[PDB]
Design an enzyme around this catalytic site. Sequence first.
Site, PDB file in Angstrom:
ATOM      1  CE  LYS A 163      52.208  49.384  45.520  1.00 54.77           C
ATOM      2  NZ  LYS A 163      53.465  50.142  45.281  1.00 54.77           N
ATOM      3  CB  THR A 164      52.405  43.331  42.159  1.00 57.99           C
ATOM      4  OG1 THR A 164      51.673  44.560  42.088  1.00 57.99           O
ATOM      5  CG2 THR A 164      51.587  42.233  41.506  1.00 57.99           C
ATOM      6  CG  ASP A 217      46.427  43.182  40.782  1.00 61.75           C
ATOM      7  OD1 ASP A 217      45.248  42.979  40.441  1.00 61.75           O
ATOM      8  OD2 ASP A 217      47.380  43.075  39.983  1.00 61.75           O
ATOM      9  CG  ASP A 218      47.360  48.256  40.351  1.00 64.26           C
ATOM     10  OD1 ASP A 218      48.048  48.596  41.337  1.00 64.26           O
ATOM     11  OD2 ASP A 218      47.844  48.113  39.209  1.00 64.26           O
ATOM     12  CE  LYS A 244      31.349  44.863  57.085  1.00 66.13           C
ATOM     13  NZ  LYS A 244      31.127  45.577  55.798  1.00 66.13           N
ATOM     14  CE  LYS A 321      58.377  48.367  37.298  1.00 66.04           C
ATOM     15  NZ  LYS A 321      56.970  47.926  37.083  1.00 66.04           N
TER      16      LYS A 321
HETATM   17  N1  LIG Z   1      62.512  42.542  47.532  1.00 64.73           N
HETATM   18  C1  LIG Z   1      61.805  42.824  46.432  1.00 64.73           C
HETATM   19  N2  LIG Z   1      60.537  43.264  46.580  1.00 64.73           N
HETATM   20  C2  LIG Z   1      59.824  43.542  45.486  1.00 64.73           C
HETATM   21  N3  LIG Z   1      60.187  43.448  44.205  1.00 64.73           N
HETATM   22  C3  LIG Z   1      61.439  43.000  44.089  1.00 64.73           C
HETATM   23  C4  LIG Z   1      62.302  42.682  45.123  1.00 64.73           C
HETATM   24  N4  LIG Z   1      63.529  42.265  44.628  1.00 64.73           N
HETATM   25  C5  LIG Z   1      63.388  42.363  43.329  1.00 64.73           C
HETATM   26  N5  LIG Z   1      62.146  42.788  42.933  1.00 64.73           N
HETATM   27  C6  LIG Z   1      61.683  42.994  41.565  1.00 64.73           C
HETATM   28  O1  LIG Z   1      61.105  44.285  41.496  1.00 64.73           O
HETATM   29  C7  LIG Z   1      59.931  44.271  40.652  1.00 64.73           C
HETATM   30  C8  LIG Z   1      58.722  44.657  41.464  1.00 64.73           C
HETATM   31  O2  LIG Z   1      57.765  45.504  40.790  1.00 64.73           O
HETATM   32  P1  LIG Z   1      56.244  45.486  41.224  1.00 64.73           P
HETATM   33  O3  LIG Z   1      55.515  44.490  40.412  1.00 64.73           O
HETATM   34  O4  LIG Z   1      56.163  45.406  42.740  1.00 64.73           O
HETATM   35  O5  LIG Z   1      55.620  46.900  40.888  1.00 64.73           O
HETATM   36  P2  LIG Z   1      54.539  47.862  41.561  1.00 64.73           P
HETATM   37  O6  LIG Z   1      55.111  48.367  42.882  1.00 64.73           O
HETATM   38  O7  LIG Z   1      53.205  47.227  41.605  1.00 64.73           O
HETATM   39  O8  LIG Z   1      54.464  49.078  40.573  1.00 64.73           O
HETATM   40  P3  LIG Z   1      53.502  50.299  40.232  1.00 64.73           P
HETATM   41  O9  LIG Z   1      53.312  51.142  41.444  1.00 64.73           O
HETATM   42  O10 LIG Z   1      54.206  51.042  39.096  1.00 64.73           O
HETATM   43  O11 LIG Z   1      52.191  49.642  39.784  1.00 64.73           O
HETATM   44  C9  LIG Z   1      59.816  42.843  40.121  1.00 64.73           C
HETATM   45  O12 LIG Z   1      60.491  42.795  38.869  1.00 64.73           O
HETATM   46  C10 LIG Z   1      60.566  42.033  41.179  1.00 64.73           C
HETATM   47  O13 LIG Z   1      61.091  40.828  40.636  1.00 64.73           O
END
Ligand SMILES: Nc1ncnc2c1ncn2[C@@H]1O[C@H](COP(=O)(O)OP(=O)(O)OP(=O)(O)O)[C@@H](O)[C@H]1O
Lengths: 349, 493, 143
Positions: A163-164, A217-218, A244, A321
């Site tokens: 997501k992030t 975020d979060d 809003k 991830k």
């Molecule tokens: N298509 C993609 N979408 C998202 N992340 C990707 C993708 N391809 C590679 N990545 C890599 O995957 C990782 C994404 O992790 P992310 O920061 O989204 O964690 P998160 O979902 O917020 O985790 P958590 O739920 O543990 O807080 C990054 O290192 C990013 O570079």
Amino acid sequence: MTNRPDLIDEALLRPGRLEVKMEIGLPDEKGRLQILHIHTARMRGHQLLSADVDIKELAVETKNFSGAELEGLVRAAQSTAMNRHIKASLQVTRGDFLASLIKPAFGTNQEDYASYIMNGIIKWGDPVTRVLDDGELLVQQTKNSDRTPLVSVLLEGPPHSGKTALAAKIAEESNFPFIKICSPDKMIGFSETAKCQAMKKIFDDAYKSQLSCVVVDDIERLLYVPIGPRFSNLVLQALLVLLKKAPPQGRKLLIIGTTSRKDVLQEMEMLNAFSTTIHVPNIATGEQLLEALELLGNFKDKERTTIAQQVKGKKVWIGIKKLLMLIEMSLQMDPEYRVRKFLALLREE
Amino acid sequence: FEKMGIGGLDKEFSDIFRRAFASRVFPPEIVEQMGCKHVKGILLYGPPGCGKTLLARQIGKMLNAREPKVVNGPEILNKYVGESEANIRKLFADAEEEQRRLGANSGLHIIIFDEIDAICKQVVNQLLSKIDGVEQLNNILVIGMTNRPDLIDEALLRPGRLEVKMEIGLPDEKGRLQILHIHTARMRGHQLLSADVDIKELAVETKNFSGAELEGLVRAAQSTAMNRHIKASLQVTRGDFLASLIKPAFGTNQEDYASYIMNGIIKWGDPVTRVLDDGELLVQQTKNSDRTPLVSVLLEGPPHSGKTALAAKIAEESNFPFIKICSPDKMIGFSETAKCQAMKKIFDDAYKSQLSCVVVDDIERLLDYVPIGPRFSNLVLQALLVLLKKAPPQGRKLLIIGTTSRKDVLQEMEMLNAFSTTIHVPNIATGEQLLEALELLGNFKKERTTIAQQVKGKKVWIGIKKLLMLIEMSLQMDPEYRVRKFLALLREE
Amino acid sequence: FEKMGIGGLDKEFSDIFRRAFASRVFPPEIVEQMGCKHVKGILLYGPPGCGKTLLARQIGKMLNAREPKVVNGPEILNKYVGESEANIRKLFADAEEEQRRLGANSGLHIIIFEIDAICKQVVNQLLSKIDGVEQLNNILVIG
Ligand SMILES: Nc1ncnc2c1ncn2[C@@H]1O[C@H](COP(=O)(O)OP(=O)(O)OP(=O)(O)O)[C@@H](O)[C@H]1O
Ligand SMILES: Nc1ncnc2c1ncn2[C@@H]1O[C@H](COP(=O)(O)OP(=O)(O)OP(=O)(O)O)[C@@H](O)[C@H]1O
Ligand SMILES: Nc1ncnc2c1ncn2[C@@H]1O[C@H](COP(=O)(O)OP(=O)(O)O)[C@@H](O)[C@H]1O
Ligand SMILES: Nc1ncnc2c1ncn2[C@@H]1O[C@H](COP(=O)(O)OP(=O)(O)O)[C@@H](O)[C@H]1O
């Protein structure tokens, strides 16, 4: 003179005393051009400024620069030219201006996005394209349309889904002059009545730029532990009212969210504040897995066939991830045993 | 430049000179032509003892200006006898006195404001006005120094005042070599240093030594040489260096690890090999790869199973320069708001090194968990959940290990989704493992067959620590009863 | 050594002597030839009544230095009539008086300071005086 027009009490404003008011805001492009023309007058008068400098380019490069930062930039450029001359008929030249170009307060910072955008984005299937397309449409709508000054959105999905990175990639491409991120790991140890102030202050800056974008975020961490429902009410209310609020006349916003627990948010009456929501799914079929493996570029053709001949039979369910974590870990084995260990690890989920 | 004796500060010194002093050395006519004011502040920050004040004093002499006068934050803060403004004024008094006496061409006066973080509260106004207000002194320069960069308030950082920053960090290997070469100059000049010393070896042995520790090491070596000579043409030599080699602050101390690693590790079966190999793989990954700067892991299993020893063993075999242990028996009686600070401070130091490892052990006792109605702490839980995903500053790396004996309770609190991966440490589960452990320890002798005849029939379930306890206790009997009693006690489990 | 009336402190005394005073008894020319600063502090800790102060005084007489003057933590802590700084200043009065007037050849002076009450989880003035802009090379502080 004041920076807080709200906190003056009514006693001084009734007519007969302090009868007039004015607002002195950030200059727009013409103001910046005029200030730049003002500050470099003397050098051009005495012919120390080179003939290659074009003020009209600096006028368009320095977006959301305040009054003092321009003067600071000119001073730094002159200092750099002097230093170059002395070697650690001088003429300040374009290169010094480019190199010197200071950190604006209301502008964009690079370190944060470097920290939240670690390895970019890899298109392993349709869902990524769909999410990017929707983000682009939303950015266009907020930039061009006139009947919707405020736009919100919330990306959600299972843990470890990606997501992030997607949020930061959508936001960072907008090219908006003002981009800001509100994160929970800058408030370790703060009490609730400091979180409220921090959030309010972060928001009260995006109302002073003709365009903006803020990332929250979060959300689940700004509030939650399910061993008995425990949370904070102050933060919840301040966040439910700020989603809003509309900016002053003629200014535009865009608030992107994020969260992994949608049901808890739904119970608390928060899904009716976000304009729309988006889903980010997990890998679900072997073909997606092979696409990701090829895109990353780790294994070769023979290993690819070895993995395919087994994985193709079953279906899998694993976030991106985690797949990055495992495929990074397995590489440390000797070249003989990489494939076997990777398959064992994946089989353990 | 070498005459000032500053090593490891090439880039910082170059940039500071460029930004802050280029104008003052240029021929006055041209700078008067361009009409640009001079910088009027500097801010230095970093970990204590890396060479900040020794840079300010040398910058003072570089311009050939008047000697400085110092001040301290808390010293000025506590004065409330009407001197709060008088001190501020008197410091600048001489500067404006000479400015009026001569004019715009008066020589510059420096003032050094140490601990500037204390003035700014998350006295200020008068100082801020004096540095820049309606009246201004064009013949002063202010230099601030601090160790807590975050707590300075925004008021001082807007351009026009304290316009520059720089960070003075721990020296890398070249910095250490240069400092060592600087400090032993005179002895080698007078030929008191022996010919066997090789600086390049000390350069690689002293990892994460700050500025002052090297000087202290040299002084201690000299003292030891003197003491040897006097017997409780002398020459300091390698032996004195090795013997003297001081306890670093950001380094590794053996005492803690000695306390947690008591009797080594015995490979009694496959699970031990599995766990150690996985640990080694994780260490290699966090050392070599650049797509994962943070890696976490959690070893969990039943009570008395052998978790702490394995964690410490994995940590110690890494060879990382910075190793630390955050244990809950150093915080007996603290309140929650002190536990948060202790944890935060233990973490905040691992970010100032190029590698590191931090071990959090006995998680369930940090939270104060007790199952007679669910009671625990929320401050600690939140402050701990936020930190397990904090990424270190650019270019650094970090590895965290965990430990716990109650997994499901943690799973209820939504914690297992913060740890990347987990490992399981099982107990002894078959008679063969029991006999192999007994043989590896090497205690019993015929008695082995006597034990085997009876143990082999059944299956057993006993942690390793408890087995060590039993086999240690039974030895105090008289020789002819030892085996019999060992069997009796074991059969009660 | 036995004239000092101490038994069971051989190792501690030897280590303290080596680390802290080996430079103060070697011929001045050689120590000046190597350019080494002199140690400026000591810290002794243990359970009550095991012989700490008697070692401080004996070390005092060992070097043939001027006799010491003692202070107490909680006594100084409570004084808040503005003498919190004046007392600290007058403590080192003699050493400051002699340093600027005799330089290298001054006779080192001692002070014996319950230092744990001051350090609370007046520090800064003492810290500056022991090591600040001025640095007296003729003092030695034992806590
Ligand atoms: N298509 C993609 N979408 C998202 N992340 C990707 C993708 N391809 C590679 N990545 C890599 O995957 C990782 C994404 O992790 P992310 O920061 O989204 O964690 P998160 O979902 O917020 O985790 P958590 O739920 O543990 O807080 C990054 O290192 C990013 O570079
Ligand atoms: N393979 C092994 N793994 C772990 N410990 C071993 C092993 N072989 C021998 N030992 C010994 O077993 C003991 C391990 O006890 P340990 O410190 O792990 O307790 P613990 O699991 O933290 O205890 P508790 O569950 O009561 O908190 C040490 O004395 C260690 O030397
Ligand atoms: N290149 C160097 N870097 C760091 N410290 C040095 C260097 N050269 C000498 N030192 C020693 O470091 C000691 C402590 O420096 P100090 O000025 O106290 O820094 P800080 O004020 O940050 O503690 C000095 O007494 C000095 O002798
Ligand atoms: N070798 C020794 N170790 C400990 N105490 C001794 C020794 N020799 C004599 N003493 C006695 O110790 C007493 C002083 O103890 P003191 O220095 O007051 O303890 P503290 O340093 O804890 O105040 C004297 O009365 C002296 O007789």
